[PDB]
Amino acid sequence: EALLEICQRRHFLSGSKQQLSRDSLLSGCHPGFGPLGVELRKNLAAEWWTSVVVFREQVFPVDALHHKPGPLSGKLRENLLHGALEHYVNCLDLVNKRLPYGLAQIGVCFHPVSIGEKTEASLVWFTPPRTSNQWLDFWLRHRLQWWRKFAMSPSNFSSSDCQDEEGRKGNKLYYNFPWGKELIETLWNLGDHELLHMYPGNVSKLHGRDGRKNVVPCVLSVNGDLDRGMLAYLYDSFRKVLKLHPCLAPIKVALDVGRGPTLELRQVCQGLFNELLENGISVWPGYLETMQSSLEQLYSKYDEMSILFTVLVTETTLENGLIHLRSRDTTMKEMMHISKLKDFLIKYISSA
Amino acid sequence: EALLEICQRRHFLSGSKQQLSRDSLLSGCHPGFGPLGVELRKNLAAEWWTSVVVFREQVFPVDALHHKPGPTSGKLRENLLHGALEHYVNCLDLVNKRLPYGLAQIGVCFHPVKSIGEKTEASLVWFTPPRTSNQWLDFWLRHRLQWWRKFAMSPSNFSSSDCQDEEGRKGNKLYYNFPWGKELIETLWNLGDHELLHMYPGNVSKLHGRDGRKNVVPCVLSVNGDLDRGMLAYLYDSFRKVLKLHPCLAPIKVALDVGRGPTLELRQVCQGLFNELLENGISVWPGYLETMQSSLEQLYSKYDEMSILFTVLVTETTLENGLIHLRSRDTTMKEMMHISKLKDFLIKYISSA
Amino acid sequence: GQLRHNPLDIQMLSRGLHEQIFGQGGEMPGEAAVRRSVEHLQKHGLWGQPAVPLPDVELRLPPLYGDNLDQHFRLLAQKQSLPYLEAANLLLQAQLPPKPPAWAWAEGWTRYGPEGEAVPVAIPEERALVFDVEVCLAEGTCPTLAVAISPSAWYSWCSQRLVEERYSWTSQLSPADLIPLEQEQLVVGHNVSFDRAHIREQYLIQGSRMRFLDTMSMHMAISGLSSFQRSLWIAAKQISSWDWLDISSVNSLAEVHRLYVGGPPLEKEPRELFVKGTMKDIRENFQDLMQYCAQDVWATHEVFQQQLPLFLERCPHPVTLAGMLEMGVSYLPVNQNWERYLAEAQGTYEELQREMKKSLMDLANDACQLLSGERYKEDPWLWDLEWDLQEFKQKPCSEEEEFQQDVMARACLQKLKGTTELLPKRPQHLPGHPGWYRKLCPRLDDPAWTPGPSLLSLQMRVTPKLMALTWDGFPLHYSERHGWGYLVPGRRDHHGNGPYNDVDIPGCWFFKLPHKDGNSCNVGSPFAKDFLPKMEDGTLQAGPGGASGPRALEINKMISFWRNAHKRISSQMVVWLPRSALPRAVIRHPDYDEEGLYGAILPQVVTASTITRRAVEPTWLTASNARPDRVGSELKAMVQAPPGYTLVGADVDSQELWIAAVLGDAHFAGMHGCTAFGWMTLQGRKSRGTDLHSKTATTVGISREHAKIFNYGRIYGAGQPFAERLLMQFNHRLTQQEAAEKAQQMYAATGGTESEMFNKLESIATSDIPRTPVLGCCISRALEPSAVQEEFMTSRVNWVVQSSAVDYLHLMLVAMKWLFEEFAIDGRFCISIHDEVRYLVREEDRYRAALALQITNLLTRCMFAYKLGLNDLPQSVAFFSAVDIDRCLRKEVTMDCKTPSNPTGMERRYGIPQGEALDIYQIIELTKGSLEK
DNA sequence: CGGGCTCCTCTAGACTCGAC
DNA sequence: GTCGAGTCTAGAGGAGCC
Ligand SMILES: Nc1ccn([C@H]2C[C@H](O)[C@@H](COP(=O)(O)OP(=O)(O)OP(=O)(O)O)O2)c(=O)n1
Ligand SMILES: [Ca+2]
Secondary structure, eight states: OHHHHHHHHTTSBOSOTTSOOHHHHHHTOSSOBOHHHHHHHHHHHHHHHHHHTTTOSSEEEOOOOSEEOSOOOOEEOSOSHHHHHHTHHHHTTTTTSOSOEEEEEEEEEEEEOOEEEEEEEEEEEEEOGGGHHHHHHHHHHHHHHHHHHSOSSGGGEEEEEEEOTTOOEEEEEEEEOSSOEEEEEEEEEOOSHHHHHHSOSOTTTTOOOSSSSOOOOEEEEEEEEHHHHHHHHHHHHOOOOOOOOTTTOSOOEEEEEOSSOHHHHHHHHHHHHHHHHHTTOOEEETTSOSSOOOHHHHHHHHHHTTOOEEEEEOHHHHHTOEEEEEESSSOOEEEEETTSHHHHHHHHHHHO | OHHHHHHHHTTSBOSOTTTOSHHHHHHTOSOOBOHHHHHHHHHHHHHHHIIIIISOTTEEEOOOOSEEOOOOOOEEOSOSHHHHHHHHHHHHTTTTTBSSEEEEEEEEEEEEOOOEEEEEEEEEEEEEOGGGHHHHHHHHHHHHHHHHHHTOSSGGGEEEEEEEOSSOOEEEEEEEEETTEEEEEEEEEEOOSHHHHHHSOSOSTTTOEEETTEEEOOEEEEEEEEHHHHHHHHHHHHOOOOOOOOTTTOSOOEEEEEOSSOHHHHHHHHHHHHHHHHHTTOOEEEGGGOSSOOOHHHHHHHHHHTTOSEEEEEOHHHHHHOEEEEEETTTOOEEEEEGGGHHHHHHHHHHHO | OOOOBOTTOOBBOOHHHHHHHTOTTOOOOOHHHHHHHHHHHHHTTOSSOOOOOOOOOOOOOOOOOSSSHHHHHHHHHHHHHHHHHHHHHHHHTOOOOOOOSSOOOOSEEEEEOGGGOEEEOSSOOOSEEEEEEEEOGGGOSSEEEEEEEETTEEEEEEOHHHHOOOSOOOSSBOGGGSBOOOOOOEEEESSHHHHHTTBGGGGSSSOOSOEEEEHHHHHHHHHOOOHHHHHHHHHHHOOOOOGGGGGOOOSOHHHHHHHHTOOSOOOOOTTOHHHHOOHHHHHHTHHHHHHHHHHHHHHHHHHHHHHHHHHHHHSOSHHHHHHHHHTTOOOEEEEHHHHHHHHHHHHHHHHHHHHHHHHHHHHHHHHGGGGGGGGGGGOTTTTTSOOOOOOOOOOOOOHHHHHHHHHHHHHHHHHHHGGGGSSOSSOOSOTTSOHHHHHTSOOTTOTTOOTTTOSOOTTSTTHHHHHTOEESSOBBOOBTTTBSEEEEEOOOOOOSSOEESSSOOTTEEEEEOOOTTOTTSOOSOTTSGGGHHHHHHTSEEOTTOTTHHHHHHHHHHHHHHHHHHHHHHHTOOEEEEOTTTSOHHHHHSTTOOTTOOEEEEOOOOBTTOSTTOOOBOTTTTSOOOOOSSOTTTTTGGGOBOOTTEEEEEEEOSSHHHHHHHHHHHHHHOSSTTOSHHHHHHHSOOTTTTOSHHHHHHHHSSSOHHHHHHHHHHHHTTOOHHHHHHHHHHHOTTOOHHHHHHHHHHHHSOOOOSSHHHHHHHHHHHTSSSOBOTTTOOBOOGGGSHHHHTTSSHHHHHHHHHHHHHHHHHHHHHHHHHHHHHHHTOOEEEEEEETTEEEEEEEGGGHHHHHHHHHHHHHHHHHHHHHHTTOOOOBSTTSSOSOEEEESBOOSSSSOOOOOSSOTTOHHHHSSOOOOEEEOHHHHHHHHTTOOOO
16 A cells, blocks of 8 residues: 555556556556666566576577467467467577477566556476476476565465366465465476477477487476566565665665755766766666755655665765765665775675 | 578578568568577667666656557557657656656557557657757757667668658658668657647646746657667678677677587586676577587587677686687687686677677 | 049049048159059050949048057057066066075965065066966866066965865866966966966956067067978087077077077976876975976076067067067857867767778778688788787586586686686787787777777778778889889889889889879878879779778768867867856846856967967967868857857958068059059959959869969969969869969969069068068078078068068057057957957947958058058058958858758857858948947 | 978887886 | 887878968
């Protein structure tokens, strides 16, 4: 309730105060996301990409269109599994037909609710049938660890083994929202049924190589809702302070100006701003605002956002180079040399 | 023709000769892009974001949905301008109603061809004060043209032309001179305020922005860029068969390989270097994992077609002194470099490019 | 009847103006003089030609003080220069106590009493000073320290940036960062223009009564040296006449001190801490630097003592000194558009340089593949480069399993990381690349490192080989002795510059590329501007074809000026005035920009830095005019008047042409138009395109600007080969035979058309003490016939007319100052580019300024006629053709300065509208012919 | 016999200083 | 003790102005 009001006010969620609700957010029928929300979702997508596609040769990006043409006229995609299955043959050549390999994509999927749009991170893992459950448990552990890694309260991320109508093994990952537990990710041991359906006959094309022998794969679908995951992280992160993990926080450091002279301090702040941008540290350009508010009010505003640190430049910075630094996690103020700020921020982000 | 063959061979394009045609590529009815094409488009979008949003204090991202509901059934989006205009009032508060400020977004728009063609578009909507509308239009024209020429081996092929609408509004249109002719890759229109007034009827108090000490209704400058057509333009521009893509745009930066025996011992060094480079933001092709070993000439040709900047060759001599053979696509020259300084050299080469 | 005609029917001055200027009493020419003039003009076919009279001008001129015009100018110049000669004489009789043993380490001015006691003062408070300012170049253009002297006082100045250490100082200068030095005052220095630019009160929009004397200017007036003379002097320190060496020196304070005072040699600081040292270096060696600055000031004082009487003897007319005083107070207003221009010019230059470097780097990278198989030995361009190679010198899994494997890989990688001990500590520069490619790439240690052969440009000797440039289908080849050229295959052991045999290239002939200056010059760069016509014709071609060659030459022409002038323009010392320092008129004006910046640039002009006593400024006397294709050529257009102000100025029409013509006429007979050249000069209107410049530009299809070069070359000793080469360079449609024919046509009649002028110039040059015909200024000692005999003859012959033009400038400045002071015109001197005077005037007094300029031109021409004893002035040369009233400095008031860096023009990019050019009649209609308010 | 200036980049040559 | 990467300087050819 209050968290949604903060998110709407601090530009995590777009629309009017009466235009957002729990069901609309969960179903994908919200008007959209604010710039801070877009940046948080992009950070989540980058972290997911780093954890899945990066550091793994077998995982490759895939590009599935938003619509499926031909007879089922056309209709919007509902899941990202079909595109990967259609790309199974083309992507087989990259690994020289060596199982296992996977295709990952973070794209918007359309679900009939009204039409709802969810940003879903899907992993389609082509597995030899022998180690299907072993890889399924491996992915379960890795995804649960990834969800708990950024969580201040990792106990709120749960898991539950489930069986579908066909009796295939599957595991569901949840998040414990204050109202209740909501599904954010699901894994299923689908098997070769869908692959054979999309590729009937001539199983020679579907054959790969598993220990120098040709074996048709068993697919594993790891589908997670990044929008609902973003809501879960926002709820976990929430004194009106949103303690988002530094790898996920949209804006790292806030840059402001003290007293006069205006031009010199603006030049210094612009130089520091350009330096931090060149070093990959997102900064809120708070020094451009001619109107100024109280320091406590500015601190509260930056804490409502996921601002890691606030940097204030004054005449003393011109005299000796010291900048006021405040930490979001602990309300402590320290003086730091202006040439050491970049290294401190990079070290903090890397350590986190 | 040969460029398309290389692109589909190296998985820039994912399709057969039936769909890989000029008309289908330009229209947007082609199948999805191959993994290298996806990486190239991601790099192009990252460069666009770096140039437009990150280093501008007045540009913020905007989330526009892929469908517009209401008046009877809804429709897919054909442009990103509508959502930006819907978010104009909400994003006015970020800049504290100070003009100019912009809303930028990269996304897929749906265009009838009644076949549907999907085009990924990078759109910037600039809410400029009315008096400086032409100045900002010229500035953005120059900036976008310089951005397109920044990664171009032949900057002259990216031209500009002045055009006017039926209503007579001024605007510019950027082109890339493809071998078949000029194609519209980016469009700039100096729209007034009537579109915002249509979307926001009633009191114009909300739409007022701060142009110095005066409150004005902003003029909407729409900059729309086709990232798919831009990627095709860069593929043609880059094209000894070698796709000399820009170092900041190439999909895979470096390639790793094992030189000689012993096989097992070099794998640990290759894994360590692989993990270090991936931790340092450098995309690596793991050529040491290929069971079917081939001659170095074929590997070099394959990496040239894939636009691989460097080929690191970890050998048994690296175990002794730590020197790894390094070859570059640009000069095809071999160099010796120590393990300790490979990451720094790669980061310097990527950043200073 | 105001219409008047001389015995030669040339329309002379209006009757009222003639009465007010010359008056009744002029001696009649006489029958013999009129007969000679008529016979000459009839023989040269000019006697019977009628010309439509120009409309008469009736002006109530300001009263002239003396009995004649010479006395009037003398009285004006004496009134102007009287307060400053007094200060100079005060300096010449100064008793100064010895310099203090220890200099004061305190910010600001400190006065040293007797025995060295240091007393803090706000300003030196002196009517005369010898000033020297030291600037720490590392921290920018802000002054660091300075020492000044006066009768019985030593003064020292220190800045906050020297005595205080702080993290950051403002890079945008303000008057509060300068030296406070400011009823009349005189400041003496060796480059006093440099020291003037560091004075706080010299950047106010309103003028100041402080003037500046320079020992370099007086040295060039007394015993100056020409550039050829300077070269010979420096060579001899390390033509059968060498007596001038002992009475001349170069414009260095040590050498001037040796020449005039001749004491112990002047000692300089060996380390050069200000030019190439940090502020800490100056802080550690403060006393030594203060001592050296004091030594320089003392040397300048002694030099000025030895020079002032010599200058007053060799330049006795007060107008010379008054003009020198007025020529050293230049002032160029600027605004934030200056910063915009700098940024835009740098950006466009970087973009064009980056396109050129992209092309060249692609050509270089693709060329490295010729190393394989030794295929470079078959390339007709890159075979001569060094292709040497340098060797390299030397002295599923579980979580626990995955963690263990990652740790093992990281530790194994770290183990090989420690082998850096065996690596040499000096990183080798690209051992695997060829040497020529090695030289083109920055080293990794370079802070400005850029990947690829970034150190590559068209000026490098490998660029034409990389681009495979061909001349008439022959590859370009470079000879160390004969410059660039091309190889014509067919040698066993085509017509062009010549088959030089010093190259001995097997199976080839070396022909030099044709040069615009003849066969005695060498081509150092095939990408010169003169090769663009040859590139377009098709004789010069690039290997890649298409537009590669033409685009390279086009970009070279676009960025050639900015390449050579960006350090000068960007480093201009701009001091931005705050709102308090601005006048109320600027603030209250509708065009005032509250968020804008207003400042000025003071040109560092040496008033007499030429043997002809011309001014010198590295940037603003070199500033290019706006062109559609030149990057940064809108430089002068950035000198923009503040709101409520306009730049009213004018340019003299055919200055040296008319000076030569009037000299020749007065030497022939005491009337205007006696000679054919003088008759031609008067009979012609620039509005109708009938002047000599336009007549030549019509006779030969060259432009009028090139006709200027042609005519002035012909006047000052250019031969027929020079004229032929100039015509071929400027008119690409001509042939060798046609150029020779047109050279004869312009040289056929010059008993000739201009014989009397040549005789007068040679007579003045060969006299015992050559002097200016108007103001009597003497030539330098190093050019008198006793010193040099028959050497540098062309230099002295041109010096006559050029120093006459400098006298014209002096007279114009004196008259303009007199008119502005008498009638209270709220304007001031802006800049004088030789014969172009520009004045920053308020909008309310622009037409009055135009009328004052016209009256000044009239009086100056009348003075030129009077000192030659003509007693009349033709109506044609009486007034300016047009006086410009514009808010920015440009050659024409209508041109919109559209450049590659300014494609939208001044009217769109900025708010500057078009100006207006007005002749005398419009000015009279707009101000009723009166300079009063 | 154009004159009077100005400054730049590029390159060769001589000198210096640290590393093997 | 030799030798190669900086480093300063001088000279040549090009290019702006009047
Ligand atoms: N190439 C040149 C250019 C100029 N001058 C000298 C002679 C001129 O008298 C003086 C001023 O140059 P201008 O360009 O003003 O030449 P004019 O005054 O003759 O032309 P205009 O009538 O356009 O002012 O400089 C010269 O000797 N050689
Ligand atoms: Ca002139």
